[PDB]
A paper describes a structure:
During the first 3 years of the pandemic, the spike (S) protein on the virus surface has been actively undergoing antigenic drift generating a large number of variants. Being a highly dynamic protein, SARS-CoV-2 S-protein has been observed to adopt RBD “up” and “down” conformations. Our structural study reveals that interactions between the VL6-57-encoded mAbs and RBD are mainly mediated by germline gene encoded residues in HCDR3 and LCDR1, while germline gene encoded LCDR3 residues support HCDR3 in antigen binding. We provide evidence to suggest that the identified class of antibodies constitute a potential immune pressure driving the genesis of S371L/F-S373P-S375F mutations in Omicron variants.
Notably, H18 exhibits detectable cross-reactivities with RBDs of SARS-CoV-1, Bat CoV RaTG13, and Pangolin CoV GD1, with affinities ranging between 134–332 nM. H18 has mild neutralization activity towards wildtype, Alpha, Beta and Delta SARS-CoV-2 authentic viruses, it also possesses activity to trigger conformational change of SARS-CoV-2 S and exhibits inhibition activity in the S-protein-ACE2 interaction mediated cell-cell membrane fusion assay. When paired with other RBD-specific antibodies, binding of antibodies to cryptic epitopes may also result in spike inactivation by promoting S-trimer disassembly.
Numbering used by the authors:
A (entry chain H): 2 to 228
B (entry chain K): 1 to 102
C (entry chain M): 31 to 127
D (entry chain L): 2 to 214
E (entry chain A): 356 to 551
Write the structure that this text describes.
C-alpha cells in the first residue's frame, strides 16, 4: 500500500507540533510502525517505533522522554506529539513500516516508507509581506528588450507563489528561490522579458498568493519618469 | 526462607541401587549449585560430588547426581553400595548470600 | 593470596550441618539470618589465621565447629578442618569423686 | 556516530563501482544483517535489498550485497541516469538499542560545462526609501554552471555585511539564474557616491555600477 | 555483544554477592579464567521468575523453544539476578514483549523477529483480530509489588567459541603473592633468576 502524510508545517521555538500519518487500504493494523528523520547536513536517525497491536512504546536511548507517539485503530492513523522545539529541528520526518522475518541476522528492514513532513522552526515568524515593484530606466534599456519585475520582501512562511496577470504570461517568466538571512528572513525575485513597444500600452501587474497568511496584495508597476 | 528437604533415614542392602533426594521449598533447585557431602561419624565431612554432575578425583564413579528442576528436587544416585558408604549425606545450596545445607 | 573464601560451619551431635558465616581476606562478611547480629569474624593476615567470635551463647549452641577453605563461594568447599568439640553447660569445673 | 562512510566515490559509466561500509563489532560484526537504501534528493527513500540474500520486487538484479565479516559491501555494474543519490548503511545496534544509519556517499563525477554569464544591477525604487531599509539587488542570469562568487564594493572599501547568495535553479533552456541582495539603510545610501556588485566566473569578471544621484 | 581484542577477569564478576542464581555448564566455574578461548558471545534479555529454570539444555517449554533454543553442545555461562526496582514501575510496566506462538521449531543461536500473525485455522485472515488468528507477540505482567516467582529478572548468558584461531579474549597470568628474603625463583619478563 501507500502511506500519505501531510505537507510542510511551521511552529514556534518552544511549542508543540502536530502531524498525522495516514494509511490507505490495509496492512497497517498488523505490523509495527516507526518514524524516520532525515536531516540535510548529517545522517539519518531513528527515534523509535510503536506497535499498534499492543500499544507499547519502544524508543531509543539517545532521545529522552519528550517525544510521544500514539496509535489509533478506528481510522488506522498515527499522531506525532513533539514539544520543546530547539534550533536544530529543521528536517523531514518519514512514516515507515516494519516487516519482520526469520534468520540468523534478524534485522529491522524498512520496506515501506511514507511521503514526508517538512517541519522547520526558526525566528521571524509570520508577518505582513511587503512587495516593491521594479521599473527599468533609460540607461538600463539599450535595445528592444527591457527587464522589469516585482520584488517581494519579509514574507513568511514557505512556500510563496507569484502569478503574472493571473497566469496570462507564460513565456519569459522566471521565479527565484529564497535565502536565509541574519535574522532568519527570506527574499525572492521575479522578472520578465518584454519588448519595449508594449511598455506604454500594456501594463504589468504582479499578484502575490500567500495561503498560510491569507494575504493577496495587488500592486501596480509603472516606469520611472526621471530615468 | 529456602530450606532443603532430605530423607532422614534411607536403608538399602549392599550391591543395589538407591536414590537420595534433596527438595527445595521456595527457590528452584536448578538456580544454584547443589553439593553433596559424605561425612563419616567422628570425622570431618568430605565432598562426594559437586556441580550437580561433577565427581571429584578420588571418589568412585558410583556417586552420580541428577537434577529434576520440575519437581524442585536434587537426586543423588548410588549404585553398588559397600561397607564404607555407611555415612551421613548432606546436600548444600547457596540461595542469595546465605549458604543453606540439607 | 589466591582469592578464595573462608567459612565457619558447625554441626550439632546427631543433627545436620549448620552454616554460620563466610569471610574474605578483605572486610566482606555475610552471616546466617538465624545467627545474625551474633557472629563476629575477623581475619589477621600477619599471623596467617582467622578467628570467629560468638556472643550470647546458650545451651543449644553445643556443636562441632569446622573451619573450611572455600574455593568457590556459592559452590563446594574443598578442605575441611578437624572439628573441635564445644560444650556449653554448668557454671564451674569440678573434680571427680 | 558508530557507522562511518566515505564522503564521495568516483567511477566510470561501464565499470564496476563498489562501496565499503565499516562499523563496529556489536552492530554489524555481531551477526546482524545490513540494509541499503537510496536517498534521492526529492523523493522518499525505498527498500533496495534486505539481508543481502533476497531480491525485493521491482529492484533490478544489478545491485549485489555481501557481508565480508565485520564489513558490508555493495557492488553495481554500469552507471545509469538514476544513480545521482546517496547510499546509506542501516543495521541494528545493540549499544544504541535501535537502528542507526550511516554517513552517505555522493555519486557524481562531472556534468557541468562552462558558459558566458551576464549580470544586471537595479537600484531600489522610490517606494523602498521610506521603509527604513535599502535592498540592493544585483541579478545574474544566463550562466552555466551555477557557481558564481559575489563581492560588493562602494568604490572605496568592500562591503562584508549583508552579503547573501541564493542557490541557482535550472531555467527553461537548461541554464541557471541567481540573485544577490544587500541589506542597507537609506540614511547612508545617498552619502555614498555609487554602489556595484562584482562577480567572477572562470576568470571572467564583469562590473556594473549605478548612481543614486 | 561480541568481545574481541580485549582482556578481562572473571573474578570481579563473582565477588559481587548480589546474583540470585548462577549456572555454568561445560567448564568448572573455578577454572575458567586460566583456560583460553577465541570469542565470547553475550546476550541480554529479561525473563520472569518462573522461567529462570527453563534456561537449560534438554527440556521443552514456551520460551526456551520459541525465542532462544539451547543446543546439546552448550558450554555457556548463564547469570541472572533481581533488579526489580529499576525495570518495573507502578501502573503496569509492559515495555518488554515476548513471543508465545510459533509455526515450528527453530535452530539454536537464532533470533526470531517475525511479526506475522500466526494462523491456527485453515483460512486466511489478512491481518485481522478475528477467528482462527492470534498475535504471537504478547505483553508481560511485570509489577514491583509481586512475589518472587513473577518479578523481572535480568538474565545474561556468556558463551565461549572454540575454533582454529589463537586466543583473543582470555584470562592473563594471575598476580601471585610477593615474597622476599628467601631463595625463590622468579621470572620478570627477561630472565628466570633464582635468588633472594
Amino acid at each position: 500500500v501507500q502511506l500519505v502524510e501531510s505537507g510542510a508545517e511551521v511552529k514556534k521555538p518552544g511549542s508543540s507540533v502536530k502531524v498525522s500519518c495516514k494509511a490507505s487500504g490495509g496492512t497497517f493494523s498488523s505490523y509495527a510502525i516507526s518514524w524516520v528523520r532525515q536531516a540535510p547536513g548529517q545522517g539519518l536517525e531513528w527515534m523509535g517505533g510503536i506497535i499498534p497491536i499492543l500499544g507499547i512504546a519502544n524508543y531509543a536511548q539517545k532521545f529522552q522522554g519528550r517525544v510521544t507517539i500514539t496509535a489509533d485503530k478506528s481510522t488506522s492513523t498515527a499522531y506525532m506529539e513533539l514539544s520543546s522545539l530547539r534550533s536544530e529541528d529543521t528536517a523531514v520526518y518519514y512514516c515507515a513500516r516494519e516487516n519482520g522475518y526469520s534468520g540468523y541476522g534478524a534485522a529491522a528492514n524498512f520496506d515501506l516508507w511514507g511521503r514526508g513532513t517538512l517541519v522547520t522552526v526558526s525566528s521571524a515568524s509570520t508577518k505582513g509581506p511587503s512587495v516593491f515593484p521594479l521599473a527599468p530606466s533609460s540607461k538600463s534599456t539599450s535595445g528592444g528588450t527591457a527587464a522589469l519585475g516585482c520584488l517581494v520582501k519579509d514574507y513568511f512562511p514557505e512556500p510563496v507563489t507569484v502569478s503574472w496577470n493571473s497566469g496570462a504570461l507564460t513565456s519569459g517568466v522566471h521565479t527565484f528561490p529564497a535565502v536565509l538571512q541574519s535574522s532568519g528572513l527570506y527574499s525572492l525575485s521575479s522578472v520578465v522579458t518584454v519588448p519595449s513597444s508594449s511598455l506604454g500600452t500594456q501594463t504589468y501587474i504582479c499578484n502575490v498568493n500567500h495561503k498560510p497568511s491569507n494575504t493577496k496584495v495587488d500592486k501596480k508597476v509603472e516606469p520611472k519618469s526621471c530615468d | 526462607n529456602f530450606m532443603l528437604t532430605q530423607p532422614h533415614s534411607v536403608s538399602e542392602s549392599p550391591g543395589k541401587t538407591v536414590t537420595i533426594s534433596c527438595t527445595g521449598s521456595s527457590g528452584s533447585i536448578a538456580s544454584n549449585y547443589v553439593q553433596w557431602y559424605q561425612q563419616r561419624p567422628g570425622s570431618a565431612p568430605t565432598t562426594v560430588i559437586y556441580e550437580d554432575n561433577q565427581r571429584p578425583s578420588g571418589v568412585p564413579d558410583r556417586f552420580s547426581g541428577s537434577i529434576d528442576s520440575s519437581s524442585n528436587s536434587a537426586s543423588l544416585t548410588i549404585s553398588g553400595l559397600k561397607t564404607e558408604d555407611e555415612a551421613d549425606y548432606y546436600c548444600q545450596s547457596y540461595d542469595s548470600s546465605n549458604v543453606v545445607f540439607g | 593470596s589466591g582469592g578464595y573464601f573462608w567459612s565457619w560451619i558447625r554441626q550439632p551431635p546427631g543433627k545436620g550441618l549448620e552454616w554460620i558465616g563466610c569471610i574474605y581476606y578483605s572486610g566482606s562478611t555475610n552471616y546466617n539470618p538465624s545467627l545474625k547480629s551474633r557472629v563476629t569474624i575477623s581475619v589477621d593476615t600477619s599471623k596467617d589465621q582467622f578467628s570467629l567470635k560468638l556472643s550470647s551463647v546458650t545451651a543449644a549452641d553445643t556443636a562441632v565447629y569446622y573451619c573450611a577453605r572455600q574455593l568457590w563461594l556459592r559452590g563446594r568447599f574443598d578442605y575441611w578442618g578437624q572439628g573441635t568439640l564445644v560444650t556449653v553447660s554448668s557454671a564451674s569445673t569440678k573434680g571427680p569423686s | 556516530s558508530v557507522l562511518t562512510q566515505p564522503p564521495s566515490v568516483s567511477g566510470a559509466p561501464g565499470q564496476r563501482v563498489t562501496i565499503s561500509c565499516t562499523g563496529s563489532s556489536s552492530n554489524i560484526g555481531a551477526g546482524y544483517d545490513v540494509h541499503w537504501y537510496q536517498q534521492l534528493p526529492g523523493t522518499a527513500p525505498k527498500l533496495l535489498i534486505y539481508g543481502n540474500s533476497n531480491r525485493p520486487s521491482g529492484v533490478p538484479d544489478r545491485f549485489s550485497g555481501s557481508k565480508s565479516g565485520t564489513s558490508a559491501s555493495l557492488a553495481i555494474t554500469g552507471l545509469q541516469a538514476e544513480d545521482e543519490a546517496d547510499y546509506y548503511c542501516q543495521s541494528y545496534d545493540s549499544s544504541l538499542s535501535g537502528s542507526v544509519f550511516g554517513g552517505g556517499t555522493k555519486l557524481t563525477v562531472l556534468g557541468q560545462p562552462k558558459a558566458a554569464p551576464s549580470v544586471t544591477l537595479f537600484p531600489p525604487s522610490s517606494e523602498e526609501l521610506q521603509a527604513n531599509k535599502a535592498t540592493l539587488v544585483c541579478l545574474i542570469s544566463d550562466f552555466y554552471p551555477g557557481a558564481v562568487t559575489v563581492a560588493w564594493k562602494a568604490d572605496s572599501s568592500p562591503v562584508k555585511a549583508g552579503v547573501e547568495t541564493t542557490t541557482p535553479s535550472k531555467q527553461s533552456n537548461n541554464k541557471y539564474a541567481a540573485s544577490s541582495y544587500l541589506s542597507l539603510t537609506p540614511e547612508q545610501w545617498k552619502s555614498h557616491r555609487s554602489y556595484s556588485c562584482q562577480v567572477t566566473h572562470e576568470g571572467s569578471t564583469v562590473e556594473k555600477t549605478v548612481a543614486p544621484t | 555483544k561480541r568481545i574481541s581484542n580485549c582482556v578481562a577477569d572473571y573474578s570481579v564478576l563473582y565477588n559481587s554477592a548480589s546474583f540470585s542464581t548462577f549456572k555454568c555448564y561445560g567448564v568448572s566455574p573455578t577454572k575458567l579464567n586460566d583456560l583460553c578461548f577465541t570469542n565470547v558471545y553475550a546476550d541480554s534479555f529479561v525473563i520472569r521468575g518462573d522461567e529462570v529454570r527453563q534456561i537449560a539444555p534438554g527440556q521443552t517449554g514456551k520460551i526456551a523453544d520459541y525465542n532462544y533454543k539451547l543446543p546439546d553442545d552448550f558450554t555457556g555461562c548463564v547469570i541472572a539476578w533481581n533488579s526489580n526496582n529499576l525495570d518495573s514501575k507502578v501502573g503496569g510496566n509492559y515495555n518488554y514483549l515476548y513471543r508465545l506462538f510459533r509455526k515450528s521449531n527453530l535452530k539454536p543461536f537464532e533470533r526470531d523477529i517475525s511479526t506475522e500473525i500466526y494462523q491456527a485455522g485453515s483460512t486466511p485472515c489478512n491481518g485481522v483480530e478475528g477467528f482462527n488468528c492470534y498475535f504471537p507477540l504478547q505483553s508481560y505482567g511485570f509489577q514491583p509489588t509481586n512475589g518472587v516467582g513473577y518479578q523481572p529478572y535480568r538474565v545474561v548468558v556468556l558463551s565461549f567459541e572454540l575454533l582454529h584461531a589463537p586466543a583473543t579474549v582470555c584470562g592473563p597470568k594471575k598476580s601471585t603473592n610477593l615474597v622476599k628474603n628467601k631463595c625463590v625463583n622468579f621470572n620478570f619478563n627477561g630472565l628466570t633468576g633464582t635468588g633472594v
